[PDB]
From a paper:
The Ras proteins are master regulators of cell proliferation and survival that transduce growth stimuli emanating from cell-surface receptors to cytoplasmic kinases responsible for orchestrating a comprehensive cell division program. Here, we report our initial findings on an alternative approach, one that exploits directed evolution to discover miniproteins having extraordinarily high affinity for the most functionally relevant surface of Ras, the effector domain. High-resolution crystal structures demonstrate that the miniproteins bind Ras as a dimer and interact via a distinct binding mode that captures the Ras effector domain in an open conformational state, which can be stabilized by insertion of a proline at Asp-38 in Ras.
Lastly, we sought to identify a Ras mutant that would stabilize the protein in the “open” conformation trapped by our miniproteins. Such a mutant would facilitate biochemical studies of this conformational state and could be used as a target for small-molecule or fragment-based screening programs to identify molecules that engage it. Upon inspection of the Ras-miniprotein structures, we hypothesized that the open state might be stabilized by destabilizing the intact β-sheet of the “closed” state via insertion of a proline into β-strand 2, thereby mimicking the strand displacement that occurs upon miniprotein binding. We subsequently found that insertion of a proline in place of Asp-38 afforded a Ras mutant that could be solubly expressed but appeared to exist exclusively in the open state. The effector domain of KRas(G12V) exists in two conformational states that each possess distinct 31P NMR shifts for the γ-phosphate of the bound nucleotide, referred to as open or state 1, which cannot bind effector proteins, and closed or “state 2,” which is capable of binding effector proteins and possesses a larger upfield 31P shift. Whereas KRas(G12V) exhibits a roughly 2:1 ratio of state 1:state 2, KRas(G12V,D38P) has no apparent state 2 population, and whereas KRas(G12V) can bind both the 225 peptides and Raf RBD, KRas(G12V,D38P) can only bind the 225 peptides. We were unable to crystallize KRas(G12V,D38P) bound to GppNHp because of hydrolysis of the nucleotide analog under crystallization conditions; nevertheless, we determined the structure of KRas(G12V,D38P) bound to GDP, and this structure revealed Ras in an open conformation with a disengaged switch I loop. In summary, these data indicate that the D38P mutant stabilizes Ras in the open conformation that is observed in our Ras-miniprotein crystal structures.
Numbering used by the authors: 1 to 165
Amino acid sequence: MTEYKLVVVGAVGVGKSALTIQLIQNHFVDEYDPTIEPSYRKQVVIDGETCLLDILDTAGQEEYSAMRDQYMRTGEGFLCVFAINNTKSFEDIHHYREQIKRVKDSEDVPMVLVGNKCDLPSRTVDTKQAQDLARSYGIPFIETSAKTRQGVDDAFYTLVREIRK
Ligand SMILES: Nc1nc2c(ncn2[C@@H]2O[C@H](COP(=O)(O)OP(=O)(O)O)[C@@H](O)[C@H]2O)c(=O)[nH]1
């Protein structure tokens, strides 16, 4: 089966780790078990095809430029995550996309825009604003909640579909 190297990027606090843990372990913070050490290699079936997701989370190294570049060289596809209640995290998406294009030396890198924490009421980034940004980038946009699991599989699966294109 094919393996897909997926990298989760985005500002500190947007929920990169929470999203990955929902995909891998199927729960949120209340069910966090510190005795369990999960694997970020997961076998899944996407559109009837079985494959392996190999996930890298940049959490803790967001501001570590040399390591950011290593993630971007390695990754086949990128989840570009912001939080819908953090406009600065949305603005940071520009810088992540730019750096990915530069490290890859390409303008057509598999990428999905993810607006996380859509379960929260206090939104500061409109769904239409994120849709327009993704449109300008030529990439999909998905709203997610690591808390309710809304859109979590869809975000990762859609990224795999982008790589498959
Ligand atoms: N309500 C809500 N909280 C979230 C969601 N995703 C993450 N969080 C919370 O946001 C905080 C930061 O999440 P984390 O994954 O550690 O952020 P990061 O690794 O810095 O990107 C954590 O305390 C999470 O509980 C979400 O979808 N909904």
